[PDB]
């Protein structure tokens with residue numbers, strides 16, 4: 145029963161959830177990976193990992209992915225949550241040097257992951273293992289695009305480190321631009337391609353309908369995270385959230401800000417419904433009778449179908465995951481699943 149302020153009747157009615165058939169094995173295999181890579185302590189893995197629903201989030205998204213592709217995506221996604229937690233803890237504890245060194249290591253590992261599989265920082269080693277596996281599915285040109293995108297993500301996290309240590313809340317437009325990077329919009333968009341087995345040509349993935357559908361799926365995911373994660377973030381002195389920027393820069397009340405974020409999220413849905421018609425028409429057009437055309441058509445159709453699945457997977461994840469259940473914590477500023 146979704147809280148009334150967070151409920152989206154259009155998602156519930158018109159975006160039925162899907163779940164990949166590999167999910168049961170995925171749940172246990174990513175938990176074992178978090179344990180074996182020492183990304184969380186064993187007692188915290190046992191108590192909290194399944195309840196965090198990280199594998200459920202990806203298995204509701206990349207439908208049709210080969211099992212090995214889904215496994216690498218799920219491990220990387222769980223890694224990305226643990227990295228968000230490390231970044232938060234380094235900010236809270238004023239560990240500017242530790243963050244700077246981790247930032248530099250991630251840039252280097254991203255370009256040479258095999259070299260870093262046994263690094264002394266288990267967070268770097270776990271990153272490198274997941275990225276090396278993601279780099280084994282498609283040509284080097286896709287790997288280079290993933291790396292270009294993630295270098296940009298790392299730098300967006302560095303900007304957040306400086307904003308939070310200096311007390312700065314970004315302006316609304318500044319925030320919206322930063323949030324496309326901190327939520328990793330273009331990484332999730334890149335990962336559609338190994339999931340459907342095809343690196344798309346620039347001419348296809350930059351088609352305006354593919355681009356706009358991809359963008360709106362990610363804006364929904366990030367802004368719905370902002371809507372649902374606002375309480376945990378206020379409690380933890382996090383400043384990065386569309387609602388916080390609106391309160392600060394536009395002088396809205398909390399209630400006014402939550403309503404404006406919710407309206408922005410609802411508009412993403414109905415803008416997506418419009419452009420989805422065009423992106424599926426484009427998938428139809430690619431099927432021109434040729435073998436290549438059929439391949440590209442099926443890949444675009446699968447990817448646009450997963451851009452739609454992201455809406456329902458992200459919506460339910462925020463009500464199922466222990467990650468956001470701040471009311472259940474003894475110390476609302478310190479989630480129990482982080483290493484403090």
Ligand SMILES: CC[N+](CC)(CC)Cc1ccccc1
Pocket residue numbers: 221224225228326327328365366369458
């Ligand atoms: C910290 C996790 N994330 C990606 C999973 C940062 C890249 C933001 C996010 C959280 C939840 C749903 C959508 C995005």
Ligand SMILES: [Mg+2]
Pocket residue numbers: 228232
């Ligand atoms: Mg966070």
Ligand SMILES: [Mg+2]
Pocket residue numbers: 228326
């Ligand atoms: Mg973050």
Ligand SMILES: [Mg+2]
Pocket residue numbers: 369370373374377
């Ligand atoms: Mg958030």
